[PDB]
Amino acid sequence: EYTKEKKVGEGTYAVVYLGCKIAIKEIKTSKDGLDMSAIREVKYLQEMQHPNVIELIDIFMAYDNLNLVLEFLPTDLEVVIKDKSILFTPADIKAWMLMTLRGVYHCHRNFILHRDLKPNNLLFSPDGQIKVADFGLARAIPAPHEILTSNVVTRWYRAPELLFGAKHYTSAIDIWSVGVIFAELMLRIPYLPGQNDVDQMEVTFRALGTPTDRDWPEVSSFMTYNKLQIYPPPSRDELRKRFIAASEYALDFMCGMLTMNPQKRWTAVQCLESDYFKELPPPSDPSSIK
Amino acid sequence: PFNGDREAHPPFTLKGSVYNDPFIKDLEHRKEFIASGFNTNYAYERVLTEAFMGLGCVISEE
Amino acid sequence: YRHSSQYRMWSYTKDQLQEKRVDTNARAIAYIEENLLKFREAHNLTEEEIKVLEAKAIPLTMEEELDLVNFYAKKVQVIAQHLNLPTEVVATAISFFRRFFLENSVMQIDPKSIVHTTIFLACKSENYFISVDSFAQKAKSTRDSVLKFEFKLLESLKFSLLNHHPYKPLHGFFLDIQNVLYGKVDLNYMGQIYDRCKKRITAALLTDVVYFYTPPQITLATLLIEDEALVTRYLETKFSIDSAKLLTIIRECKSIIEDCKPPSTEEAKKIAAKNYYCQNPSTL
Ligand SMILES: Nc1ncnc2c1ncn2[C@@H]1O[C@H](COP(=O)(O)OP(=O)(O)O)[C@@H](O)[C@H]1O
């Protein structure tokens, strides 16, 4: 729509506007004419309609730039980092996980990757339904002989095959990210931080374990597994210590979601029915979020 | 009751141990292809459900 | 499929598509007849020559536009296949060119410059990854002729930049034949199907079939070339979806694909000198 008000965003790639209930995202056109991450982010967000992925009302052309629409309210990152412990493990940890996995499954059954998943990518709504947006490095799931990119997702939310250097991966790299969203939501801390380097591999090995030959096979075919040594995987003494605010069935699909095996990683069709939402209490979308 | 996904289930069938495809079944025998999480049934489930998307008509256009 | 961009706003019927052709030929007549009555400053001498070029251009290109854009679609197909591209990006380039010229005519945007831009937006669409200068040195472009007709191509395309194509239904019905049937399989069906039906669907994308039916229906239409035991025994044993309606849909799609007529070397003369340049002859 042709309505504008005050701006959000200090980034030089895009500065988003606001107006009407909507938010106009403008890509500055002024090398190449149009960037990869403008057509790459309109061409899959145009064709999805869901209550967990935002949609385009109009994509009307500007004089030089490209206009989109977005959502009004802020994101999941400002919810976690600044509260007075409103969020409670009976109900608030279940509904947002259920809706984010619903959005991830709607991306997956359209065979679209969406390899940029962050709490500043997951944003809420006035009725509190969390949305999946910002498809800036998304890609359709191609033919198996096609070479993909490498560094496609951010550091703190990176799948370990992307740490190791998997050039042509599957779409199981975005279940690891939402499992880290689960742990970041029930721990209220930035989970697995790195020092702007290759140190994400060492902190992931320190947290969840250096993969062994017997279990996730062919991990030594990356020219990175020989650089380091083995670390012990965590046992079920993690149930009380460092994860004491959790239920019995939460650790089952958390450990099934933080599998470092990508072939044995639980896809969303077996994460939406992983008997964790069946346990009491039932969730409800009125949550005390400002 | 409740449903985890509100409407997200197709009713068609699949059997991945039957085919003799010369583009993926030979492609999965390599080393670096397995190491990125690739198996045969994921690609076949990707392509066979795409082969049945949209069996409608031209009467359903107005 | 109804949530996809190809169904909700670019899938048509025969009456709706012919209405689309006559409205893009009806909205693009007045500006072009106004811009080609420009005579000299004082008076016009060659009245008969400018009226026979007006009779060649204005009431004749309402049907010459369709085989003109089919000829230039054949041109962009052979130059996209010339520069070593996959069959997926060739199909998207053909679809982007044809979808550009459904909303605009060939006179107010010349088709000789769109044919290098569509390969660029197709390879940047599904990640081919050619650069601009590497694309220019492999073509007859000097970096400016591939980028000026880019904003308006996306505006006239209205940003339906992902397209569904029948090659993944080929790889699906390459496998679903073998699952339901075991009598006569995979000798001739890997001998002479993957090398023939692919070229038949490139010839189908040159024709006007993808605005009519879904790409599995076009796939099962082009699989009916060998209908001795394959397609009839496939659709009878598959059976929520009735069979005979799908056989009639595939049969009328085959009736659509069989009304074929290739290009010629005559359409070139009308646009070569009459439009924008012949006048110069009249002037001097
Ligand atoms: N719908 C929105 N409502 C409010 N703020 C938004 C909205 N969308 C984006 N923003 C802001 O735009 C910026 C996102 O731009 P970008 O850097 O491209 O995302 P990313 O870091 O995932 O790559 C963020 O600062 C975000 O706060």
XYZ file of C-alpha atoms and ligand atoms in Angstrom:
663
model
C 0.000 0.000 0.000
C 1.014 3.630 -0.547
C 1.273 4.468 3.155
C 4.431 5.229 5.135
C 5.526 6.241 8.633
C 8.684 6.026 10.791
C 11.525 3.694 9.844
C 13.001 0.590 11.476
C 16.468 -0.722 10.683
C 19.961 0.776 10.565
C 21.277 -1.831 8.106
C 22.544 -0.588 4.746
C 21.074 -3.530 2.806
C 17.437 -2.699 3.614
C 15.583 -0.237 5.848
C 12.003 -1.275 6.550
C 9.137 1.188 6.780
C 5.794 0.923 8.568
C 2.200 1.884 7.916
C -1.268 0.670 7.008
C -0.800 -2.645 10.111
C 1.880 -3.439 7.521
C 5.589 -2.747 7.093
C 7.057 -1.709 3.744
C 10.417 -3.377 3.104
C 12.506 -1.522 0.514
C 15.547 -3.015 -1.224
C 17.922 -0.295 -2.428
C 18.746 -1.077 -6.057
C 21.594 1.424 -6.465
C 27.844 -4.381 -10.247
C 24.598 -6.283 -10.776
C 21.247 -4.557 -11.125
C 19.143 -6.614 -8.714
C 20.763 -8.650 -5.960
C 20.315 -12.381 -5.471
C 18.702 -11.859 -2.043
C 15.802 -9.755 -3.370
C 14.329 -11.994 -6.061
C 15.466 -14.895 -3.836
C 13.287 -13.563 -1.017
C 10.237 -12.552 -3.029
C 9.999 -15.674 -5.207
C 9.216 -18.120 -2.385
C 7.397 -15.816 0.029
C 4.970 -14.932 -2.778
C 3.664 -18.496 -3.118
C 3.215 -19.489 0.549
C -0.061 -18.938 2.389
C -0.209 -20.066 6.020
C -0.952 -18.662 9.496
C 2.732 -19.196 10.348
C 4.485 -17.612 7.323
C 3.694 -13.999 6.403
C 2.301 -13.118 2.990
C 2.294 -10.293 0.455
C -0.691 -7.987 0.120
C 1.010 -6.076 -2.697
C 4.500 -6.025 -4.227
C 3.952 -2.762 -6.136
C 6.953 -1.300 -7.942
C 8.721 1.830 -6.723
C 10.648 4.313 -8.861
C 13.959 2.468 -8.433
C 13.491 0.148 -5.455
C 11.329 -2.898 -4.713
C 8.514 -2.666 -2.165
C 7.151 -5.528 -0.059
C 4.869 -5.812 2.959
C 5.634 -7.326 6.366
C 4.192 -7.575 9.894
C 3.866 -4.863 12.556
C 4.922 -6.276 15.939
C 8.456 -7.200 17.166
C 10.138 -10.582 17.266
C 11.035 -13.547 19.477
C 14.531 -12.229 20.294
C 13.297 -9.244 22.314
C 10.886 -11.565 24.147
C 13.666 -13.833 25.451
C 16.352 -11.261 26.259
C 14.249 -8.847 28.344
C 11.496 -10.085 30.673
C 10.931 -10.846 34.362
C 10.409 -14.636 33.915
C 6.860 -14.564 32.541
C 7.519 -17.630 30.364
C 6.561 -20.892 32.065
C 7.351 -24.465 30.949
C 3.730 -25.776 31.324
C 2.243 -23.893 28.369
C 4.370 -21.073 26.932
C 7.133 -23.399 25.692
C 4.704 -25.642 23.763
C 2.508 -23.309 21.684
C 5.336 -21.311 20.103
C 7.283 -24.498 19.332
C 4.138 -26.025 17.787
C 3.506 -22.987 15.585
C 7.157 -22.636 14.495
C 7.263 -26.314 13.529
C 3.967 -25.837 11.671
C 5.600 -23.039 9.672
C 8.750 -25.120 9.120
C 6.634 -28.039 7.873
C 4.736 -25.731 5.515
C 8.100 -24.567 4.157
C 9.256 -28.194 3.899
C 6.205 -29.550 2.081
C 6.563 -26.764 -0.493
C 10.175 -28.069 -0.877
C 11.644 -24.681 0.054
C 14.613 -24.579 2.425
C 14.460 -21.219 4.324
C 17.988 -21.442 5.715
C 17.833 -18.249 7.806
C 16.175 -19.083 11.146
C 16.777 -16.836 14.169
C 14.683 -15.448 17.039
C 14.960 -12.138 15.164
C 13.545 -14.026 12.168
C 10.625 -15.551 14.102
C 8.177 -12.752 14.834
C 4.879 -12.650 16.712
C 1.555 -10.967 15.894
C -1.207 -9.016 17.742
C -3.028 -12.326 18.272
C 0.290 -13.883 19.303
C 0.745 -16.364 16.443
C 4.479 -16.607 15.778
C 5.444 -16.269 12.119
C 8.312 -17.522 9.961
C 9.700 -14.821 7.686
C 12.803 -13.156 6.173
C 13.470 -15.625 3.358
C 16.712 -13.900 2.359
C 18.879 -16.981 1.838
C 16.099 -19.438 1.030
C 16.300 -21.875 -1.872
C 14.107 -24.486 -3.497
C 15.225 -28.052 -2.881
C 17.001 -28.700 -6.181
C 18.007 -31.731 -8.174
C 20.449 -33.919 -6.167
C 23.319 -33.283 -8.614
C 23.221 -29.502 -8.066
C 25.893 -27.861 -5.910
C 24.580 -25.515 -3.218
C 26.341 -22.898 -1.081
C 28.026 -23.253 2.309
C 27.693 -20.407 4.826
C 23.935 -19.936 4.509
C 22.716 -19.708 8.134
C 24.018 -17.640 11.048
C 26.668 -18.766 13.515
C 24.703 -19.493 16.692
C 21.993 -21.420 14.787
C 24.134 -23.436 12.377
C 23.717 -27.124 11.597
C 26.905 -29.147 12.263
C 27.059 -30.406 8.675
C 27.331 -26.733 7.722
C 30.139 -26.411 10.271
C 31.869 -29.370 8.627
C 31.345 -27.975 5.126
C 28.501 -29.889 3.456
C 28.250 -28.386 -0.014
C 24.999 -30.046 -1.163
C 22.844 -30.675 1.905
C 19.248 -31.668 2.625
C 16.488 -29.698 4.346
C 17.210 -31.172 7.795
C 19.492 -28.216 8.613
C 16.482 -26.113 9.649
C 15.246 -28.530 12.302
C 18.552 -28.108 14.171
C 17.939 -24.356 14.226
C 14.444 -24.650 15.703
C 15.749 -27.166 18.245
C 18.214 -24.487 19.296
C 15.165 -22.136 19.402
C 13.614 -24.677 21.828
C 16.697 -24.689 24.055
C 17.119 -20.893 23.802
C 13.468 -20.478 24.804
C 13.621 -22.817 27.793
C 17.043 -21.569 28.942
C 16.577 -17.754 28.389
C 20.207 -17.461 27.217
C 21.934 -17.324 23.830
C 22.557 -21.018 23.251
C 25.932 -22.134 21.790
C 27.850 -18.861 21.213
C 30.989 -18.557 19.119
C 33.849 -16.052 19.010
C 33.306 -14.870 15.374
C 35.519 -17.685 14.084
C 35.628 -21.489 13.672
C 35.040 -21.714 17.458
C 31.391 -22.709 16.885
C 32.659 -26.223 16.059
C 34.558 -26.492 19.366
C 31.668 -25.155 21.443
C 29.226 -27.529 19.656
C 31.620 -30.419 20.366
C 31.872 -29.244 23.983
C 28.084 -29.006 24.350
C 26.617 -31.975 22.454
C 29.595 -34.095 21.452
C 32.185 -34.909 18.816
C 30.417 -37.419 16.511
C 32.025 -40.868 16.455
C 32.687 -43.200 13.515
C 30.256 -45.873 14.735
C 27.256 -43.520 14.822
C 26.917 -40.683 12.306
C 28.984 -42.319 9.480
C 31.056 -40.540 6.794
C 31.806 -37.561 9.063
C 35.511 -37.923 8.187
C 34.871 -36.917 4.544
C 34.956 -33.158 5.203
C 38.746 -32.510 5.723
C 37.798 -31.040 9.125
C 37.204 -34.094 11.384
C 40.936 -34.883 11.547
C 41.715 -31.417 12.948
C 40.233 -32.192 16.377
C 39.854 -35.019 18.898
C 36.824 -36.702 20.462
C 34.631 -35.315 23.275
C 32.139 -37.274 25.439
C 28.482 -36.987 24.436
C 26.167 -36.032 27.316
C 24.319 -38.776 29.169
C 20.912 -38.551 30.874
C 22.423 -36.833 33.927
C 21.582 -33.689 31.896
C 17.925 -34.203 32.917
C 18.405 -32.373 36.233
C 21.658 -30.408 35.868
C 21.685 -27.509 33.295
C 18.162 -28.425 32.104
C 16.169 -28.682 35.359
C 13.273 -26.563 34.002
C 11.998 -29.210 31.591
C 9.567 -32.110 31.304
C 10.076 -35.806 30.583
C 8.917 -35.703 26.948
C 10.674 -32.418 26.130
C 14.150 -33.979 26.278
C 13.074 -36.830 23.976
C 12.237 -34.652 20.987
C 14.927 -32.140 21.971
C 17.527 -34.921 21.731
C 15.818 -36.124 18.560
C 15.966 -32.558 17.226
C 19.587 -31.996 18.280
C 20.755 -35.183 16.610
C 23.987 -34.391 14.864
C 23.060 -37.179 12.443
C 21.185 -35.445 9.586
C 19.793 -38.649 8.064
C 18.380 -39.761 11.427
C 17.263 -36.221 12.277
C 13.561 -36.024 13.004
C 11.692 -34.320 10.182
C 8.717 -32.103 10.983
C 6.180 -34.762 9.932
C 7.518 -36.806 12.878
C 8.038 -33.758 15.105
C 4.414 -32.585 15.002
C 3.334 -36.004 16.358
C 6.255 -36.785 18.687
C 3.909 -37.323 21.739
C 5.195 -34.157 23.492
C 2.149 -32.019 22.718
C -0.028 -34.949 23.838
C 1.283 -34.591 27.399
C -0.595 -32.316 29.785
C -1.051 -29.281 29.933
C -2.650 -28.168 26.648
C -1.220 -24.919 25.261
C -3.096 -21.698 24.588
C -2.227 -18.635 22.499
C -3.081 -15.854 25.101
C 0.410 -15.234 26.490
C 1.536 -12.234 28.547
C 3.863 -10.676 25.967
C 4.150 -6.900 25.651
C -9.079 -33.627 20.679
C -6.373 -31.818 18.717
C -4.323 -32.113 15.549
C -0.631 -31.237 15.463
C -0.850 -30.086 11.859
C -4.293 -28.824 10.864
C -4.408 -30.091 7.261
C -1.048 -31.462 6.132
C -1.452 -35.135 5.147
C -1.606 -36.576 1.600
C -3.200 -40.026 1.135
C -0.977 -41.493 -1.607
C 1.411 -44.420 -1.122
C 5.105 -44.978 -1.800
C 7.570 -47.879 -1.829
C 11.223 -46.907 -2.157
C 12.738 -50.405 -2.319
C 11.349 -51.128 -5.802
C 12.863 -48.589 -8.199
C 16.014 -48.786 -10.346
C 16.681 -45.092 -10.974
C 20.040 -44.435 -12.700
C 20.418 -40.875 -11.365
C 20.039 -41.162 -7.559
C 20.570 -44.860 -6.697
C 24.016 -44.633 -8.307
C 24.513 -41.126 -6.866
C 24.076 -42.337 -3.271
C 26.994 -44.776 -3.570
C 29.499 -41.901 -3.410
C 31.197 -40.682 -0.246
C 30.378 -36.966 0.001
C 26.730 -37.403 -1.020
C 25.884 -39.514 2.056
C 27.769 -37.118 4.378
C 25.259 -34.273 3.865
C 22.260 -36.318 5.008
C 21.095 -37.580 1.619
C 19.100 -40.795 1.326
C 16.971 -42.173 -1.494
C 13.483 -42.015 0.060
C 13.706 -38.267 0.763
C 14.402 -37.477 -2.904
C 11.724 -39.923 -4.075
C 9.210 -38.452 -1.614
C 10.195 -35.019 -2.924
C 9.684 -35.928 -6.594
C 6.700 -38.329 -6.460
C 4.510 -35.951 -4.459
C 5.501 -33.222 -6.919
C 4.399 -35.594 -9.693
C 0.851 -35.630 -8.259
C 0.424 -31.937 -7.404
C -2.537 -30.410 -9.172
C -4.689 -33.142 -10.740
C -7.605 -30.791 -11.359
C -9.283 -29.417 -14.481
C -10.057 -26.266 -16.463
C -13.636 -26.192 -15.151
C -12.127 -25.150 -11.792
C -10.860 -21.828 -13.129
C -13.873 -19.488 -12.890
C -1.142 -26.470 -6.165
C -3.875 -23.858 -5.686
C -1.603 -21.989 -3.262
C 1.145 -21.793 -5.899
C 1.714 -18.695 -8.010
C 1.185 -20.520 -11.315
C -2.383 -21.560 -10.474
C -3.923 -18.539 -8.789
C -2.999 -15.893 -11.343
C -1.361 -17.324 -14.470
C -3.362 -20.507 -15.224
C -5.971 -19.852 -17.882
C -8.625 -21.434 -20.084
C -9.074 -21.156 -23.843
C -11.615 -18.313 -23.695
C -9.695 -16.465 -20.968
C -6.379 -16.876 -22.796
C -7.814 -15.744 -26.148
C -9.383 -12.814 -24.277
C -5.909 -12.066 -22.873
C -4.435 -12.081 -26.405
C -7.125 -9.764 -27.752
C -6.845 -7.358 -24.810
C -3.061 -7.092 -25.092
C -3.606 -6.521 -28.811
C -6.445 -4.090 -28.025
C -4.598 -2.028 -25.395
C -1.540 -1.810 -27.674
C -3.037 -0.363 -30.867
C -3.727 3.350 -30.208
C -0.250 4.382 -28.999
C 1.443 2.618 -31.915
C -0.937 4.048 -34.514
C -0.334 7.485 -32.961
C 3.464 7.084 -33.012
C 3.628 6.017 -36.688
C 1.612 8.862 -38.237
C 4.621 11.185 -37.758
C 5.111 12.802 -41.167
C 7.500 15.634 -42.097
C 7.436 19.119 -40.584
C 5.842 20.823 -43.607
C 3.921 18.178 -45.589
C 3.979 14.485 -46.486
C 4.933 13.398 -50.011
C 4.884 9.572 -50.054
C 1.321 9.019 -48.878
C 0.882 5.605 -50.531
C 4.079 4.146 -49.038
C 3.265 5.253 -45.489
C -0.303 3.913 -45.811
C 0.861 0.523 -47.117
C 3.307 0.274 -44.197
C 0.359 1.282 -41.970
C -1.671 -1.536 -43.552
C 1.275 -3.894 -43.025
C 1.722 -2.897 -39.361
C -1.585 -1.843 -37.757
C -4.347 -4.331 -38.846
C -2.001 -7.262 -39.631
C 0.198 -7.737 -36.527
C -2.782 -8.724 -34.354
C -2.165 -12.297 -35.562
C 1.477 -11.917 -36.674
C 2.421 -11.244 -33.036
C 1.707 -14.833 -31.938
C 3.902 -16.602 -34.473
C 6.430 -13.768 -34.096
C 6.747 -14.476 -30.371
C 6.833 -18.225 -31.122
C 9.710 -17.573 -33.561
C 11.612 -15.490 -31.015
C 10.821 -18.135 -28.381
C 12.512 -20.645 -30.692
C 15.397 -18.166 -30.969
C 15.786 -17.806 -27.191
C 15.479 -21.604 -26.838
C 18.298 -22.287 -29.292
C 20.572 -19.572 -27.888
C 19.908 -20.777 -24.330
C 20.748 -24.327 -25.406
C 23.763 -22.947 -27.308
C 25.493 -21.563 -24.197
C 25.449 -24.864 -22.221
C 22.512 -24.487 -19.861
C 20.450 -27.156 -18.061
C 16.960 -27.992 -19.269
C 15.378 -26.457 -16.157
C 16.664 -22.932 -16.772
C 15.864 -23.124 -20.509
C 12.238 -23.906 -19.597
C 12.095 -20.990 -17.155
C 13.622 -18.669 -19.778
C 10.997 -19.735 -22.352
C 8.229 -19.275 -19.778
C 9.554 -15.855 -18.679
C 9.740 -14.670 -22.303
C 6.240 -15.936 -23.146
C 4.777 -14.570 -19.896
C 6.398 -11.215 -20.656
C 4.772 -11.071 -24.060
C 1.308 -12.027 -22.817
C 1.002 -8.642 -21.081
C 2.921 -6.536 -23.626
C 3.007 -6.607 -27.417
C 6.053 -6.884 -29.658
C 5.950 -3.327 -30.992
C 6.088 -1.080 -27.919
C 8.741 -3.422 -26.502
C 10.980 -4.914 -29.198
C 11.471 -8.705 -28.866
C 15.093 -8.679 -30.040
C 16.277 -7.237 -26.705
C 14.103 -9.250 -24.290
C 15.731 -12.514 -25.468
C 18.995 -11.778 -23.647
C 17.389 -10.478 -20.439
C 15.197 -13.556 -19.856
C 18.182 -15.919 -19.769
C 19.768 -13.590 -17.190
C 16.700 -13.493 -14.945
C 16.229 -17.248 -15.395
C 19.804 -18.080 -14.387
C 19.675 -15.613 -11.491
C 16.223 -17.026 -10.639
C 17.094 -20.625 -9.727
C 20.601 -20.106 -8.969
C 22.442 -20.782 -12.082
C 25.107 -18.273 -11.026
C 26.514 -16.686 -13.990
C 27.927 -13.163 -13.458
C 26.953 -10.188 -15.568
C 30.228 -9.746 -17.464
C 30.708 -13.502 -17.896
C 27.192 -13.627 -19.331
C 27.997 -10.663 -21.588
C 31.218 -12.148 -22.980
C 29.441 -15.442 -23.744
C 26.671 -13.533 -25.561
C 26.344 -10.578 -27.940
C 25.697 -8.212 -25.029
C 27.734 -5.282 -23.716
C 26.363 -5.320 -20.064
C 23.747 -2.612 -20.802
C 21.464 -4.633 -23.082
C 20.760 -7.259 -20.385
C 19.870 -4.849 -17.567
C 17.690 -2.046 -18.947
C 14.747 -4.362 -19.741
C 14.772 -5.909 -16.272
C 12.548 -3.811 -13.984
C 9.746 -3.676 -16.553
C 10.053 -7.408 -17.255
C 9.421 -8.106 -13.576
C 6.627 -5.512 -13.569
C 4.866 -7.088 -16.567
C 5.638 -10.545 -15.150
C 4.117 -9.411 -11.793
C 6.781 -11.313 -9.827
C 5.623 -14.899 -10.432
C 9.272 -15.816 -10.651
C 8.980 -19.469 -9.558
C 7.470 -21.832 -12.130
C 6.478 -25.498 -11.955
C 7.791 -27.551 -14.861
C 7.037 -31.078 -16.146
C 10.567 -32.499 -15.605
C 9.921 -33.405 -11.978
C 6.681 -35.151 -13.095
C 8.951 -37.000 -15.575
C 11.139 -38.142 -12.717
C 8.021 -39.011 -10.711
C 6.290 -41.039 -13.425
C 9.654 -42.549 -14.274
C 9.279 -44.258 -10.901
C 5.526 -44.688 -10.402
C 5.260 -46.796 -13.571
C 7.702 -49.307 -12.071
C 5.984 -49.394 -8.669
C 2.481 -50.317 -9.840
C 3.463 -52.377 -12.914
C 5.859 -55.305 -13.257
C 4.867 -57.026 -16.519
C 6.646 -54.994 -19.217
C 8.799 -52.354 -17.519
C 12.093 -50.424 -17.746
C 13.639 -51.917 -20.905
C 12.145 -49.604 -23.550
C 11.060 -47.147 -20.879
C 14.687 -46.378 -20.114
C 15.650 -47.020 -23.737
C 13.632 -44.394 -25.585
C 11.505 -42.320 -23.171
C 13.951 -40.087 -21.262
C 15.544 -39.036 -24.584
C 12.218 -38.373 -26.361
C 9.630 -37.024 -23.902
C 12.122 -34.384 -22.712
C 12.433 -32.975 -26.243
C 8.662 -33.260 -26.682
C 8.110 -31.109 -23.589
C 10.671 -28.558 -24.833
C 8.560 -28.484 -28.013
C 5.476 -28.243 -25.772
C 6.887 -25.211 -23.938
C 7.492 -23.677 -27.362
C 3.762 -24.181 -27.954
C 0.890 -22.943 -25.776
C 0.087 -25.776 -23.366
C 1.398 -24.709 -19.927
C -1.293 -22.058 -19.520
C -3.912 -24.805 -20.014
C -3.071 -27.814 -17.842
C -0.997 -28.800 -14.829
C 2.565 -30.132 -15.556
C 1.668 -33.723 -14.515
C -1.151 -33.575 -17.084
C 1.281 -32.307 -19.750
C 3.675 -35.099 -18.692
C 0.988 -37.764 -19.059
C -0.048 -36.197 -22.372
C 3.467 -36.484 -23.780
C 3.762 -40.017 -22.376
C 0.851 -41.066 -24.660
C 3.227 -41.313 -27.659
C 3.728 -44.919 -26.519
C 0.138 -45.715 -25.504
C 0.284 -49.384 -26.529
C 0.611 -50.692 -22.966
C 2.014 -47.912 -20.733
C -0.475 -45.135 -19.988
C -3.750 -47.080 -20.232
C -2.451 -49.807 -17.922
C -1.067 -47.123 -15.594
C -4.227 -45.073 -15.126
C -6.632 -48.033 -14.973
C -4.967 -49.688 -11.965
C -4.190 -46.453 -10.093
C -7.868 -45.337 -9.821
C -10.432 -40.143 -4.784
C -9.703 -39.337 -8.436
C -11.769 -40.936 -11.188
C -9.897 -42.307 -14.179
C -12.029 -41.573 -17.266
C -12.170 -37.819 -16.617
C -8.370 -37.825 -16.427
C -8.155 -39.793 -19.700
C -10.405 -37.200 -21.363
C -8.258 -34.360 -19.945
C -5.061 -36.019 -21.243
C -6.751 -36.719 -24.612
C -7.844 -33.106 -25.110
C -4.346 -31.996 -24.067
C -3.035 -34.265 -26.842
C -5.556 -32.617 -29.175
C -4.091 -29.255 -28.120
C -0.452 -30.311 -28.608
C -1.040 -31.871 -32.055
C -2.191 -28.405 -33.643
C 1.420 -27.513 -34.406
C 2.922 -25.243 -37.066
C 6.608 -24.235 -37.112
C 8.039 -20.789 -37.890
C 9.112 -19.278 -41.213
C 11.503 -16.637 -42.551
C 8.556 -14.134 -43.806
C 7.586 -12.500 -40.502
C 11.064 -10.937 -40.502
C 10.354 -8.618 -43.451
C 7.389 -6.811 -41.870
C 9.333 -5.724 -38.783
C 12.760 -5.333 -40.396
C 12.111 -2.117 -42.359
C 8.496 -0.960 -41.909
C 8.735 -0.185 -38.185
C 10.812 2.805 -37.073
C 13.245 2.746 -40.059
C 11.531 2.613 -43.474
C 10.369 6.177 -42.858
C 13.947 7.217 -43.099
C 13.689 5.828 -46.607
C 10.644 7.976 -47.251
C 12.392 11.040 -45.880
C 15.428 10.482 -48.079
N 7.857 -7.037 10.268
C 8.865 -6.297 11.011
N 8.408 -5.577 12.020
C 9.262 -4.840 12.787
N 10.581 -4.856 12.503
C 11.045 -5.591 11.474
C 10.203 -6.315 10.720
N 10.913 -6.946 9.776
C 12.195 -6.615 9.942
N 12.270 -5.778 10.992
C 13.623 -5.355 11.258
O 14.514 -5.448 9.898
C 15.694 -5.925 10.214
C 15.927 -7.246 9.449
O 16.776 -7.004 8.345
P 17.907 -8.177 7.956
O 19.268 -7.746 8.439
O 17.943 -8.373 6.479
O 17.498 -9.568 8.679
P 18.587 -10.785 9.028
O 19.475 -10.355 10.180
O 17.819 -12.065 9.420
O 19.440 -11.062 7.811
C 15.669 -6.193 11.738
O 16.326 -5.243 12.378
C 14.169 -6.160 12.123
O 13.998 -5.619 13.487
